[PDB]
From Swiss-Prot, chain A:
This is Inner kinetochore subunit CTF3. Keywords: Acetylation, Cell cycle, Cell division, Centromere, Chromosome, Kinetochore, Meiosis, Mitosis, Nucleus. Signal peptide: none annotated. It is found in: Nucleus; Chromosome, Centromere, Kinetochore. It comes from Saccharomyces cerevisiae (strain ATCC 204508 / S288c) (Baker's yeast). Component of the heterotrimeric kinetochore subcomplex CTF3, which consists of CTF3, MCM16 and MCM22. The CTF3 subcomplex is part of a larger constitutive centromere-associated network (CCAN) (also known as central kinetochore CTF19 complex in yeast), which is composed of at least AME1, CHL4, CNN1, CTF3, CTF19, IML3, MCM16, MCM21, MCM22, MHF1, MHF2, MIF2, NKP1, NKP2, OKP1 and WIP1. Interacts with CTF19. Interacts with CHL4. Present with 319 molecules/cell in log phase SD medium. The modification N-acetylserine is found at S2. One of its GO terms (cellular component) is nucleus.
Curated annotation (Swiss-Prot), chain B:
This is Centromere DNA-binding protein complex CBF3 subunit C. Component of the CBF3 copmplex, which is formed of CBF3A/CBF2, CBF3B/CEP3, CBF3C/CTF13 and CBF3D. CBF3C interacts with CBF3D and SGT1. It comes from the Eukaryota. Acts as a central component of the centromere DNA-binding protein complex CBF3, which is essential for chromosome segregation and movement of centromeres along microtubules. CBF3 is required for the recruitment of other kinetochore complexes to CEN DNA. It plays a role in the attachment of chromosomes to the spindle and binds selectively to a highly conserved DNA sequence called CDEIII, found in centromers and in several promoters. The association of CBF3C with CBF3D and SGT1 is required for CBF3C activation and CBF3 assembly. The chain holds residues 320 to 478 of 478 of the full protein. It is found in: Nucleus; Chromosome, Centromere.
Curated annotation (Swiss-Prot), chain C:
It comes from the Eukaryota. Present with 1900 molecules/cell in log phase SD medium. One of its GO terms (cellular component) is kinetochore. Acts as a component of the centromere DNA-binding protein complex CBF3, which is essential for chromosome segregation and movement of centromeres along microtubules. CBF3 is required for the recruitment of other kinetochore complexes to CEN DNA. It plays a role in the attachment of chromosomes to the spindle and binds selectively to a highly conserved DNA sequence called CDEIII, found in centromers and in several promoters. GO terms for molecular function: centromeric DNA binding; DNA binding, bending; DNA-binding transcription factor activity, RNA polymerase II-specific; identical protein binding; zinc ion binding. GO terms for biological process: kinetochore assembly; mitotic spindle assembly checkpoint signaling; septin ring assembly. Component of the CBF3 copmplex, which is formed of CBF3A/CBF2, CBF3B/CEP3, CBF3C/CTF13 and CBF3D. This is Centromere DNA-binding protein complex CBF3 subunit B. It comes from Saccharomyces cerevisiae (strain ATCC 204508 / S288c) (Baker's yeast). Pfam families: Cep3, Zn_clus. The keyword Phosphoprotein applies. Keywords: Centromere, Chromosome, DNA-binding, Metal-binding, Nucleus, Phosphoprotein, Zinc. Disulfide bonds: none annotated. SMART domains: GAL4 (SM00066).
Length: 704, 154, 557
């Protein structure tokens, strides 16, 4: 690609004095096509522009032609290439008589080239530009190239500082000089350009009127004629070399406005305050010169829009970019001081301060660590329960501490403080609500690869406290405790699905006798979670041996749950939830039933469980309306004694229509309601799904 | 050995002999062996937990453990050791079909094991159950086990 | 979204303000009525791949085993062989005459080529043996060497009659003397049954001579040669137990020679080197018959240009069917590997142009052409049955039509015995069962026209196989009735798996066949001293009605 183009330039440099008949022309001919195709990057141009002046074997006629045609730059052409051209520019003298003189026509052609590609010049560091501007002004005094650097000098000098009286004297004297024939035309535009920079400049208008001409040539001198073919290829070359850089439309536009500037001549650490900053684009230029006036009232108390208030929240952020964040930062102390006042109610009202500080404290997790660690105290809860609750919902689930990895021991003591606070108070239900946010935070710990075991250990201590008599009960309790517990089971269920986390399996496996509490409690939603957890657990624990503590308690759960749900053979079993079945018997004879045909079979089944008793009736009533049978089910509970008595009374009418089709007895009924319960989408589909797998009779109809 | 709870060697499909030395606590329930695993030798091990096989025999027998303690009855002269005592399950009380079921239970935890060796142990927190086939071939080596009280052969 | 019709809701065409094109209907969802959507045309996927996984187990335990290699016999009812009860074997020998047998040998010169040539070679020397056979009959003295040639020629006669056309049977044999012995009707001469019942009697004559020669104690190479001829006909499929025992003895006698490399040796004798070359083609046939007869019954297994080409073609088919019984998933790289050779070895099949003047060349070309077709169908069905590649659906259809038109092409130009080759059933039984199983779950127009011409092809086969023809149509009828039961009963969706009565039928179908191939019940009986809930609803009636109507024990003889 560009390596061969380097060789072509090197080919004209490696060989000298050969004087071939056509080999030199062929290399130049190869340079004609290679220059436009590959762009002649800046390092190549520096060697090429030095080669033309170094070697005089090639005629100056073709030296101008290659500058006009081959010099189509795609590179950055920094000041190093321009300095080499500046070295080529000049005239021989007594001091430089030994140095070979470059042709003046080649210098004029070279001066014509960078004018076309001035738009590609680097954005200067405003340190060597003063040297370059003086150099160009000194080079401007040569007549053969005065007509081409004159449009250039108009361009790089855009400031009142660049309008220097010593530069004014040189430009004016050349026009006043008789032996130029073009300086009065050249000086007039430069003086006009310098006029618009400094202002009125009554000294510059008295010089122009002395050097004024008939101004037809000035009109022609105002217009700068750049070759359209030169720019058309240049636009294509620039786009190809650098995609999404130097667009062709803007490259033509940038040249045009540089040309229009010449036409307009005839018609015509530094401290910057953050208070006055309004535009982010200006802020980008002001970034090296940004300075923040230290005022605490504003920088947090008032975006895609453009305004000073658009950068409002960014002001609190750019200072953290300007200087490293620290605990002594004024914005970081304002929130704590405002927070300190709001708990003590020394502020006017805490309601409006919270949303702004919460958003600030939502990010900057290292800062949020300081806020949470100091205000998580028992004493700070005594002042007001609601204000502690509000801040628990903002910064708890979004915090991931990595400073010491020893904050787990602080939470168990502090979490128990709220619980103990709720005991003697007598409930408020504020303990369960505060736990749910911690569970959200725990999953954030679980999501992170670090401290996976640390988070799981914290979760286990929650279940022991959550499963106490006063906070969790099947007789007198709150939905808050159960709804907090059902979310915890989903965390472990989701943890089982993840395979990228290689954690400790005893953490996933829940306690042996703690599942008797969840199973015995007749909360229909709670029982749904247990079936999901049991099914997901059995997906794992397959490589474990037949004899093991983890797999023995899992099989015990499956057998006990099915006996309590559908098997209806608890008495024949040896135990149920760690309780001997004969204990159940003793209660039964003490219980009274007006007509006890099958006393034992009514209580222990899917229909007899109080959690799933009435929802069983609801599904049946839906079936009766859909099928539109002759007789509806008048009873309120489904059991063996009601079903046969219902069929025995209407046995004459059973023979012709009976009941809903597809069912012959109660045993068929108990599944038919479950088929609908499994068919529809509802929270207790999970109950039927669990019972399908471990019923071996119905598993036959499934494939494999 | 089971620091992470579970220990397996299934991926080592060609493993045949495993040697454990200078380990404090080893539980055989957590360890999972491959299909061709045949020999297991342990030396200078502090604590050992044998396979938890006793209750599985109890369920099949449906006999109380205290009553089962009255069931067992006290070639081995070639390799008798004073440290332990050899006890066997009685054949008169157990039916032949029932006895065959009892032997099959023991082999459930003895899938492909052929050689077992005990050397310099300190305590075993359960009854030691070994099949009659491995014991009668002198492939059960309870050596320097002065702390082991009894071993049951079924 | 899966929109292929772009046709409006028919109920909603009444007021067609909008059409969301959603299933069942966006307008119906706004209307909240799915029943009204069902009343219209209006133009469930996770059960098809698992069932295709299950199909491989089904066809291995039904078509391959339980239809051909199964046999149920009770020793108590079966009468043992007694003295003076072998006169039927002698009667059939006396029925054959000296002149009649020579015409049989003349027919095998050009019509039975590429079958006998693999094992016995030319029959020119056999013409000398048959002349000696008639002379040896008069003499009372017999020799073991003489009896082996006696049994070998009788094996050839069984192969000749099984293959010669019915019209050539009339002028060679007189059916009248055969009526009074069999006791059957005199109205039928050679149409069906009579020709078949003649084949087994001659086949039993060949085995009787070996028992008369006491081959139990005298080993010879002719024992292997005789059996390989019996493998050309349908004899092994009729008595799977007899053929498996005979194959083991053939392997036992063959392994006594202990030949590692069968290539000719320059340092050995020229006749010995030649004898080792012709022993190579016998070994290849033994290896081929081992794979063709592979099953749970036989536990002992043993591991010129056209013969080697024929053998390694079966080796190509060996890799495909090894995954049928196992539940493992073959890797894709080896699964697509076979195709890159399947096309190059089908290019060498048609490399030999033809030779129309002799039927020997035509038959071998027909057999070779049939080999590639029956293994390409398996390879392309291999794509669908595990990977569900879209392009394989059409190719499976296309290759199945190739064997459809290949058999019917043989009925037009004096090649009616071309379709009597035993393995033509093996190819067609697998293709008619897969499409029938495919049509009960996926309905397509292309496959519908593919089933109608297959069931007629089975009825067009020659009626020399007999009972095996009647068993396959019954199996297809049972599969045809399943789609009548699949659509009538709605599919249940538990959320993770489907439950249908037809699935129970398929799973219970395999269990019964596996029960028949169980020797534990025979072991306890053979000793002679050690032998003396929660069913949901309305599904037992469906499954038991079909089980009572159609029983898989019917296809078992």
């Amino acid at each position: 690609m560009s390596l061969i183009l380097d060789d072509i330039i090197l080919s004209l440099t490696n060989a000298n004095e050969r004087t071939p008949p056509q080999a030199l022309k062929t290399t130049l001919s190869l340079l004609y096509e290679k220059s436009k195709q590959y762009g002649l990057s800046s390092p190549q141009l520096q060697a090429l522009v030095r080669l033309l002046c170094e070697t005089s074997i090639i005629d100056t006629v073709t030296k101008v032609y290659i500058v006009e045609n081959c010099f189509l730059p795609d590179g950055y052409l920094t000041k190093e290439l321009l300095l080499e051209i500046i070295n080529h520019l000049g005239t021989p003298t007594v001091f430089s008589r030994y140095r070979i003189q470059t042709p003046p026509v080649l210098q004029s052609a070279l001066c014509k080239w960078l004018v076309h590609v001035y738009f590609l010049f680097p954005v200067h560091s405003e340190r060597e530009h003063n040297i370059s501007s003086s150099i160009w002004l000194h080079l401007w005094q040569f007549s053969f190239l005065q007509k081409w650097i004159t449009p250039l000098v108009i361009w790089q000098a855009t400031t009142p500082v660049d309008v220097k009286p010593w530069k004014l004297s040189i430009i004016k004297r050349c026009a006043m000089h008789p032996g130029y024939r073009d300086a009065p035309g050249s000086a007039t535009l430069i003086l006009q350009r310098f006029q618009c920079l400094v202002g009125a400049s009554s000294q510059i208008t008295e010089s122009i009127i002395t050097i004024n001409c008939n101004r037809k040539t000035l009109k022609s001198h105002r217009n700068l004629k750049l070759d359209a073919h030169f720019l058309s290829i240049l636009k294509r070359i620039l786009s190809r070399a650098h995609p999404a850089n130097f667009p062709a439309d803007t490259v033509q536009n940038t040249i045009d406005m540089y040309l229009s500037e010449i036409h307009q001549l005839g018609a015509d650490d530094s401290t910057v305050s953050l208070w006055d900053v309004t535009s982010l684009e200006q802020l980008a230029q002001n970034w090296p010169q940004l300075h923040i006036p230290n005022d605490v009232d504003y920088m947090m108390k008032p975006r895609k829009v453009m305004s000073r208030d658009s950068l409002k929240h960014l002001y609190s952020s750019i200072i953290l970019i300007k200087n490293s964040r620290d605990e002594s930062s004024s914005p970081y102390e304002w929130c704590i001081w405002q927070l300190k006042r709001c708990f003590a109610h020394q502020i006017e009202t805490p309601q409006e301060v919270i949303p702004i500080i919460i958003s600030v404290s939502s990010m900057d997790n290292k800062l949020s660590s300081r806020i949470i660690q100091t205000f998580c105290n028992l004493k700070y809860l005594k002042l007001d329960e609601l204000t502690l609750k509000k801040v628990c919902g903002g910064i708890l689930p979004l915090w991931k501490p990595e400073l010491i990895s020893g904050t787990r021991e602080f939470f168990v003591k502090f979490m128990a403080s709220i619980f103990m606070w709720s005991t003697r108070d007598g409930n408020n239900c504020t303990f369960s609500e505060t736990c749910f946010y911690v569970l959200q935070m725990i999953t954030n710990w679980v999501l992170d690869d670090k401290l996976i075991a640390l988070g799981l250990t914290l979760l286990h201590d929650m279940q022991s406290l959550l499963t106490l008599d006063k906070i969790f009960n099947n007789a007198t309790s709150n939905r808050f405790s159960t709804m907090a517990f059902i979310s915890s089971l989903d965390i472990l269920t989701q943890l089982s699905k993840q395979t990228k986390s290689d954690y400790a399996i005893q953490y996933l496996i829940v306690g042996p006798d703690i599942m008797n509490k969840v199973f015995s409690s007749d909360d229909p939603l709670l029982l749904s979670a247990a079936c999901r957890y049991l099914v997901a657990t059995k997906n794992k624990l397959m490589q474990y041996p037949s004899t093991n503590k983890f797999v023995r308690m899992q099989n015990q759960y499956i057998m006990d749950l099915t006996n309590y749900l559908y098997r209806n053979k608890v008495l024949s079993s040896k135990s149920l939830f760690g309780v001997s079945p004969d204990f159940f018997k003793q209660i039964l004879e003490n219980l009274y039933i007006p007509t006890a045909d099958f006393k034992n079979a009514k209580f222990f089944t899917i229909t007899g469980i109080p959690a799933l008793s009435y929802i069983c009736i609801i599904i049946l009533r839906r079936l009766e309306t859909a099928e539109n049978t002759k007789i509806k089910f008048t009873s309120g509970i489904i059991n063996e004694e009601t079903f046969n008595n219902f069929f025995r009374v209407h046995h004459d009418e059973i023979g012709q229509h009976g009941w809903i089709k597809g069912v012959n007895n109660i045993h068929d009924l108990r599944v038919k309601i479950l088929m609908h319960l499994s068919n529809t989408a509802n929270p207790y589909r999970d109950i039927a799904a669990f019972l399908f797998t471990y019923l071996k009779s119905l598993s036959k109809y499934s494939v494999q | 050995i089971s620091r992470t709870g579970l220990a397996d060697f299934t991926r080592w499909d060609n493993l045949q002999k495993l040697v454990l030395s200078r380990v404090a606590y080893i539980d055989l329930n957590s360890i999972v062996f491959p299909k061709n695993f045949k020999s297991l030798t342990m030396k200078r091990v502090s604590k050992i937990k044998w396979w938890n096989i006793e209750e599985n025999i109890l369920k099949e027998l449906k006999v109380d453990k205290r009553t089962f303690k009255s069931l067992y009855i006290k070639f081995t002269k070639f390799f008798n050791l004073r440290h332990t005592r050899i006890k066997e399950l009685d054949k008169s009380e157990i039916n032949q079909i029932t006895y065959l079921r009892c032997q099959a239970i023991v082999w459930l935890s003895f899938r492909t094991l052929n050689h077992i060796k005990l050397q310099n142990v300190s305590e075993v927190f359960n009854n030691i159950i070994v099949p009659r086939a491995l014991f009668d071939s002198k492939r059960v080596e309870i050596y320097r086990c002065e702390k082991i009280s009894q071993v049951l052969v079924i | 979204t899966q929109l292929k019709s772009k046709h409006p809701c028919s109920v909603c065409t009444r007021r067609k303000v909008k059409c969301d094109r959603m299933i069942p209907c966006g307008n119906c969802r706004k209307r909240g009525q799915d029943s009204e959507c069902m009343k219209s045309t209006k133009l469930s996927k996770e059960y098809l791949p698992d069932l295709l996984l299950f199909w491989q187990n089904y066809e291995y335990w039904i078509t391959n085993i339980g239809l051909y290699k199964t046999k149920q016999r009770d020793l108590t009812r079966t009468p043992a062989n007694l003295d003076t009860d072998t006169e039927e074997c002698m009667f059939w020998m006396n029925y054959l005459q000296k002149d009649q047998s020579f015409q049989l040998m003349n027919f095998a010169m050009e019509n039975l080529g590429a079958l006998y040539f693999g094992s016995i070679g030319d029959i020119s020397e056999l013409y000398l043996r048959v002349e000696q056979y008639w002379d040896r009959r008069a003499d009372k003295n017999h020799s073991v060497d003489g009896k082996y040639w006696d049994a070998l020629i009788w094996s050839v006669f069984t192969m000749c009659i099984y293959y010669m056309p019915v019209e050539k049977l009339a002028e060679i044999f007189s059916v009248y003397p055969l009526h009074e012995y069999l006791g059957s009707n005199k109205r039928l001469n050679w149409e069906d049954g009579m020709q078949l019942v003649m084949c087994q009697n001659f086949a039993r004559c060949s085995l009787f001579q070996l028992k008369q020669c006491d081959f139990m104690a005298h080993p010879d190479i002719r024992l292997v040669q005789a059996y390989l001829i019996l493998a050309t006909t349908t004899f092994p499929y009729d008595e799977p137990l007899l053929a498996n025992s005979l194959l083991t003895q053939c392997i036992h006698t063959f392994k006594n020679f202990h030949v590692d490399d069968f290539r000719p040796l320059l340092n050995d004798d020229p006749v010995e080197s030649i004898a080792k070359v012709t022993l190579g083609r016998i070994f290849y046939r033994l290896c081929g018959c081992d794979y063709l007869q592979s099953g749970p019954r036989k536990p002992i297994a043993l591991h010129n240009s056209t013969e080697v080409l024929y053998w390694k073609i079966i080796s190509l088919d060996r890799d495909l069917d090894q995954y049928l019984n196992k539940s493992s998933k073959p890797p894709l790289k080896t699964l697509d590997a076979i195709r890159r050779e399947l096309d190059i070895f089908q290019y060498k099949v048609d490399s030999l142009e033809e030779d129309f003047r002799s039927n020997n060349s035509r038959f071998q070309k027909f057999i070779a052409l049939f080999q590639i077709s029956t293994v390409s169908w398996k390879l392309f069905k291999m794509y669908l049955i595990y990977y569900d590649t879209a392009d394989s659906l059409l190719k499976v259809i296309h290759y199945s039509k190739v064997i459809i038109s290949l058999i019917v092409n043989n009925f037009h130009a004096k090649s009616e015995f071309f379709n009597r080759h035993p393995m033509v059933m093996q190819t067609i039984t697998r293709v008619v069962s897969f499409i029938s199983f495919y049509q009960i779950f996926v309905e397509s127009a292309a496959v519908k026209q593919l089933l109608v011409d297959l069931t007629e092809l089975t009825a067009n086969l020659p009626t020399i196989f007999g009972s095996k023809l009647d068993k396959l149509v019954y199996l297809t009828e049972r599969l045809s009735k399943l789609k009548l039961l699949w659509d009538k009963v709605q599919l249940l969706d538990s959320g993770d798996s489907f439950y249908h009565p037809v699935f129970k039928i398929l799973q219970n179908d395999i269990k019964i066949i596996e029960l028949k191939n169980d020797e534990m019940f025979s072991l306890i009986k053979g000793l002679g001293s050690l032998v003396p809930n929660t069913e949901p609803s309305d599904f037992r009636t469906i499954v038991e009605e079909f089980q009572s109507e159609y029983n898989i024990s019917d296809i078992l003889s």
